[model samples]
Target: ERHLDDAFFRGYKNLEPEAKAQLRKMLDTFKKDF
Candidate 1:
């Protein structure tokens, strides 16, 4: 989870438009899980 969070932010900076939307959804899911 730690590594995945780091990777998420690292890749987030370079995400393309469509990917940003998908990533946001994944983030929302993570929020709910927590």
Candidate 2:
């Protein structure tokens, strides 16, 4: 969260589709399975 927060603070809000896909990929790796 810290890294992302800092990135957001620096006006790095506009992300590309490929960037979003990588973010989702990393998040899904950490997601818990039922």
C-alpha TM-score for every candidate:
0.48, 0.49
- Candidate 1 on 1-34: residue-level lDDT in tens? 9999899788897889899989899879999995
Model 2 CA lDDT for position 21: 70
Winning candidate number (TM-score): 2
Candidate 2 ranges with C-alpha deviation above 4 Å: 1-13, 32-34
Question: What C-alpha lDDT do the candidate models reach, one value each?
Answer: 0.89, 0.72
RMSD of each: 3.1, 3.9
Q: Give model 1's clash tally.
A: 0
The positional error of residue 15 in candidate 2, measured at the CA in angstroms, is 0.6
Determine which window of 10 residues in candidate 2 has minimal summed lDDT.
8-17
